[PDB]
Amino acid sequence: KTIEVTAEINCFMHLLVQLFLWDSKELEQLVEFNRKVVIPNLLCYYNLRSLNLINAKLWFYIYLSHETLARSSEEINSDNQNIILRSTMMKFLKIASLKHDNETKAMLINLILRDFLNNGEVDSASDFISKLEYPHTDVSSSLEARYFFYLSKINAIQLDYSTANEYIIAAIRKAPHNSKSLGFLQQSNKLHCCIQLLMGDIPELSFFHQSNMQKSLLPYYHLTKAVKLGDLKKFTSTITKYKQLLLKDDTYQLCVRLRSNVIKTGIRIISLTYKKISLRDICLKLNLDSEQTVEYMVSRAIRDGVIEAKINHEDGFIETTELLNIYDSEDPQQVFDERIKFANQLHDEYLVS
Amino acid sequence: TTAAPLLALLRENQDSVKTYALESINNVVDQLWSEISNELPDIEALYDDDTFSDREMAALIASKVYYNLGEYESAVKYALAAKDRFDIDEKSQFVETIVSKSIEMYVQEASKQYTKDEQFYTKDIIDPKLTSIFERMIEKCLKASELKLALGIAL
Amino acid sequence: YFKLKKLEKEYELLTLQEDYIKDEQRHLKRELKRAQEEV
């Protein structure tokens, strides 16, 4: 009548464990079996005065059947049922309001945003910024790895580098689990190791073996001989033989930045970092491309801010500006803004707990 | 085609141009309104069009787009001009949320303009359609003539 | 409905009891050394 309904709330996720892994047969009917919980005796019964009684793992088992492409594949290959599911995933967003969903609302957009990898508009995420501002109630256990893991691929569009350093840590925090050690931990270091070749360096080649298989990161170690050293010849031989390893998820599209660093970092291995350079000395290492197009190599990196240089049209005199006057006014201030907010960051937590 | 030329389709007779697509939208507007971020200047343009007679529905859309945005004033004031475009018997969150906002926003012009004139809702000082929405959800529970439910409103 | 008039009881307690002590913390610290040095 009253108490008997409350005691059956925790009975949802109990018996649904044995319906995962081993027996995958028709898991979309389980969604219809989940609908027996969803519509009746939940939305039409409760007054929506409760918060902690709704978890993100309720509907999380739906999309897990879409990437199988073997047994379930929705109810049909046409994938016409996901139209209702698209409104079903967002059905709880309308339930989230000013006075409703002070906690679960945080975990709603996430799985919806985690669904935007290969399907769904990713430009609405810029429009989701208006509704993205909420106070964070708590972080418990497995959230840390579930925020930016799939979102580490956002930087594969906007063409940005330094941002990937801050958000790649979310993939390696509490990454290994019982069933996630093989499945979700491999993709963590695959996106982590490539970012280590974009700006910084790899601390150790064998340090990543304890988490991800070294053979999976093996081609990235050969790219260190090419991308990190800025060599185009050894880069083409690496992509050709390892192209089979590039057939994984979003492992091909990261090669766009791998071949761009060959030009960017290639300037660094060349003496262009030094002040006085001539074009006839430049054509030696860049001979693999051409002569007259070298002026496009240096000039492109000047507007982006990698290195500044002056090019002569006759003999190709290269004068690169070396700034010894930096870190004087307003240059360190960008770092000073972070050092100021670190004091009260951990100090205000003492008043809370 | 930007938001401005969309009014040219209203220079002829169709009221369903944006309404015919609202079959699966008009109810869920509290969800998909993120795509209207580019159509924001078109929202107020549909209400000021005389050839467009669904502006009361467009006024209701203006309430549902600014609802989840966090603005309670726009989620109400734009719904006064709609008269009845929507059934209040659903008793959803859209029905109950306005009840709390319609009472709170009514006090804003209550304790101030009442000192000068007794009736502040008759003239143009405040939208007179606030009485119309006051006759919808508020008088729905007043059918039994119970003052206990209207107690805090008159205070 | 009628409870809304009584929801301002505990809401106004924590607001009046907050700034009352916050200002006193600076007075008790200054008045500390007055009696501390007095003995």
Partner: peptide, 28 residues
């Protein structure tokens, strides 16, 4: 109504801070 729920949700948030203001006052 939101005015009923929003008022109650602001209690437990400021409760812990006021408790330690009295503890620091009693410590002095």
């Amino acid at each position: 109504e939101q005015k009923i729920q929003e008022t109650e949700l602001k209690i437990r948030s400021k409760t812990e801070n006021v408790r330690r203001l009295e503890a620091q006052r009693n410590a002095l």
